[PDB]
Amino acid sequence: EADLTDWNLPLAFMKKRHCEKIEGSKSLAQSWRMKDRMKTVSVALVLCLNVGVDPPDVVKTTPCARLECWIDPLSMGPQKALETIGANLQKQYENWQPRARYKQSLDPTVDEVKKLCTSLRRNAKEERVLFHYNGHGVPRPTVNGEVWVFNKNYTQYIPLSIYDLQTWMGSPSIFVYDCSNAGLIVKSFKQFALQREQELEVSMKNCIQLAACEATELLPMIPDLPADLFTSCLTTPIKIALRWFCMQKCVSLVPGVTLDLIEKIPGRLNDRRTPLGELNWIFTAITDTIAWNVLPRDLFQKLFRQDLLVASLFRNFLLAERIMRSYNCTPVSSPRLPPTYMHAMWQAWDLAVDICLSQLPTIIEEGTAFRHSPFFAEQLTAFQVWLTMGVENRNPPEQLPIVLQVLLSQVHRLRALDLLGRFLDLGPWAVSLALSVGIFPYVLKLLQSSARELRPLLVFIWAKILAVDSSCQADLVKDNGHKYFLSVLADPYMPAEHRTMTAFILAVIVNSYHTGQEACLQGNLIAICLEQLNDPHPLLRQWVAICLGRIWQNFDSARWCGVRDSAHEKLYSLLSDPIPEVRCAAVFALGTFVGNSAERTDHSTTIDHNVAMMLAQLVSDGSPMVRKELVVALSHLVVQYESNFCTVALQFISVYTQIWRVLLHLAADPYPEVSDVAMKVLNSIAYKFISATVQTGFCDWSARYFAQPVMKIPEEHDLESQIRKEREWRFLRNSRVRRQAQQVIQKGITRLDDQIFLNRNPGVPSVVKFHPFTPCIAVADKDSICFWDWEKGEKLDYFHNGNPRYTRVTAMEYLNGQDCSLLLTATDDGAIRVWKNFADLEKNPEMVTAWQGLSAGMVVDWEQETGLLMSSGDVRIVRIWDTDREMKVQDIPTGADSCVTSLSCDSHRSLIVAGLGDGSIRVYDRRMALSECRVMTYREHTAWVVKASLQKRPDGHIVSVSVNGDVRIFDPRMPESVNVLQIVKGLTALDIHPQADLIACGSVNQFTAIYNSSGELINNIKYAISCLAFHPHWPHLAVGSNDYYISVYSVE
Amino acid sequence: RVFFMDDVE
């Protein structure tokens, strides 16, 4: 079939740089940064336990609840018990915040609490101070807002107003209450805060309260539980959680588990490899997960991420709420947390605890080996399952804090980093979420590890983070992670993708940051980039060049280091790189290297002149982006040498003159954006301030690549994608068109006198081009380009090509005719420009790319299969532009004084033919050397060859017709004409059809002869015919007279 | 830091 031909055709000017506008992605407002770091410098422990005496308010039962801080006061005497309980509570709090000035109070008086709290506030005026109160041995707080403590003789409970309590305290403080009606305490505290606010007109959010109960509720009196329950949940969550689990009906599933066995559990809270440490780690992960999923982001950051002690207190407060809900008790906190007792992660906590302590009897008795709990592995499996179809921005995964927790240890660190990288690959929103959870400090600390397997995952994660948020450069420089990145970049064995990842990271670090630039200079980044400059990887070279450019941006020491290393000479090689992106990056780097001369010795002037003359040969460049970067580099040159450029400009109203000529060339650029930038740069020179400096968005546009996902399969490879189905339908339509055309041609050619339509144009139809498949004909006028249809018969579009009055659209072509077609329009001065969306309903005319070619009119011959483009005209040179590399590949010499009137080529062979004004028809073979490119030169005409077109068949027959009108069919293997014909004495225009041998000619007397290769008379249509065009597939012909009328003819 | 990253070299 004819489908394989369409599929294996490169799509010229169809890439990211052509479709997407070259601009930087706007940086989002990254609020993941922690505003301030509070510290609990001191903790106050007020324990009004009243050991040995029961409060009158509550009549305790005979067994009662005698356990305070896991200590039985009645066994060891009153004073000794109180001291031991105070010490044990200090130890339990030190378990969470070891570095704090703990000052215990054992049954204190009002003045004693006054002195304690005032001294602590004087010690820490602006840092958090924890106040811990135990009202188990004193009467309940009253509605009036008072707290009961002891007098000197311990004969009566003297009250203590909460107003005075918070007057002695300060605004930065957290309060933990363990009383019966602690809700009354919280309500009175808030009422006093409101009273203070009312008085202030003529410390509410800052102070945090944790309360054991609501105002109405009473503490539980069950003998099994400790009397000190809320503090046991807050300070020793794992022990109380296991004790509470061993009291539920879930124990029935696991026989042989008792509180006596829990008392003898092995391991410590710190060693995560031990069962107790594993349980503590799992509890931390689950509580953090519940807090993250339930609480809002702002409250989660304020509570569970500000400081260690408050975060731990609230993580244990979740467990306190869950435990005390079952005893008709509701803990109260100053910021009202939404209820978390029903969260689904508590079931996972129960299952994990069950699995962990189901092995406990064997550990205790048989002394077996403790197998690690599969909790984290299963949670990471769930995270992976979410990521499998997590492309859509659905509800965020519940396992992000679990990923953060499992990042801490090394047992599953590599898998956690892999999953985190896969998640950050999803997009900027995923990176923002991960930074909001608080992975940044831990990923930053991970850079200290010397494990070589972590390097790819870490560089991937850091590249994503820096692509999203660029403010991390200061933190990376502070922690010396740039040393880690330099070590990554200096390993040839590393895969190239991670090396370009690290190159991007280093480019972002040094981006407009003098500290980072100096740090990387002292890290020998220049040499590292230079050694990896000629690497066979386009993106690696591009980002190495960008990093080199950003290193010496306003940095004279970096420029000196580059000069010593001959960085400019080595960077000159990238200016000829086939990839346009690398050329643009090299131009950016060279311009930035120029822009920081700062008046050094004559060697600096010489090297600036050398770089300028090396960049001044890059004007003849296909890529408008690279030319814009060249304009920016030349603007840097101008800023460096403003006085010399002013003198040069005033001279005409020898190095700077050449740069001025280059800028003038760039000013009259076909691409509007390059022309505008060059014009602005030139105007900045005449009136001679810093505001004239303009920076292009190429660097940020390149950095946008790392924001987009990379791992997932591209949309083109998707077989069931809509785009591929549309392309398949288009190719099916093209195959049908070709088959129908071949069937029509097989039936012969009858007389063609059918006039499909007759219209009027605003301008003279100069060149008419048929779209091969869709029913669109592109007619170019002097100052416009119309697109008519021969089915609907309506004017679709009316462009302005942009060429000046003297110029004229001479040649035209349809790039990518099979699908997603472009329109190439070459003016007679050299300007070649490509149009997109030229016949669309919901899209406006669009200019893809443009570049001044060369520098009869201008003749163009597109070659879709090889991707090359040959332009010719008045010059004695035939240029061969390659749209893939966007650079001129060959310039074969015409070797004749007359202009190239026509140009055509044979597919699958190098048989570039060219009609000439003098009459000769030269043929060129680009396989051989330039001096041997010329193959044959036969001169049997003296007139402008109207069209020396060629036949696509293997037996190519150059049908060359001059103004004299004498047809001479030539062959590439015979130096003499095979067939000679004479048609019209005065000929004006003609066209040839490759499939059907139909030579359509013009005439001054309105005649239009459509003859055959044999010269047989077929049709003499009676109406200067200056534009004829044949449909490449159908036997259609377009006739446009000197009058602005267009017609399309067909055979029945 | 809120948590304790261990085994970091």
Residue numbers in the entry:
A (entry chain E): 18 to 219, 236 to 686, 806 to 840, 950 to 1116, 1125 to 1292, 1303 to 1331
B (entry chain G): 399 to 407
Publication text:
pmcMechanistic target of rapamycin (mTOR, also known as mammalian TOR) is an essential serine/threonine protein kinase that responds to nutrients, growth factors, and cellular energy to promote cell growth. mTOR nucleates two distinct complexes, mTORC1 and mTORC2, each characterized by specific subunits, targets, downstream signaling pathways, and functions. mTORC1 contains mTOR, regulatory-associated protein of mTOR (RAPTOR), and mammalian lethal with SEC13 protein 8 (mLST8). RAPTOR binds the LST2 TOS sequence to present LST2 to the kinase catalytic site in mTOR for phosphorylation of LST2 S670. mTORC1-dependent phosphorylation at S670 leads to monoubiquitination and stabilization of LST2.
To further improve the resolution of the visualization of TOS motif interactions, we analyzed mTORC1 in complex with the synthetic LST2 TOS peptide, for which higher concentrations could be reached compared to full-length LST2. Single-particle cryo-EM analysis achieved a resolution of 3.27 Å (map6—SI Appendix) for the TOS-binding RAPTOR region. The LST2 TOS peptide contains three negatively charged residues which make electrostatic interactions with the positively charged TOS-binding pocket. F401 and M403 anchor the TOS peptide by binding in particularly deep cavities in the TOS-binding site, via hydrophobic interactions with surrounding residues. Finally, a comparison of LST2 TOS and previously described 4E-BP1 TOS binding shows that the TOS peptides, in particular, the consensus phenylalanine (F401 in LST2 and F114 in 4E-BP1), share a common mode of binding to the RAPTOR pocket. Superimposition of the two TOS peptides in the RAPTOR binding pocket shows that the first phenylalanine of the TOS motif lies in the same position in both structures. The TOS peptide bound RAPTOR with a dissociation constant (Kd) of 330 nM.
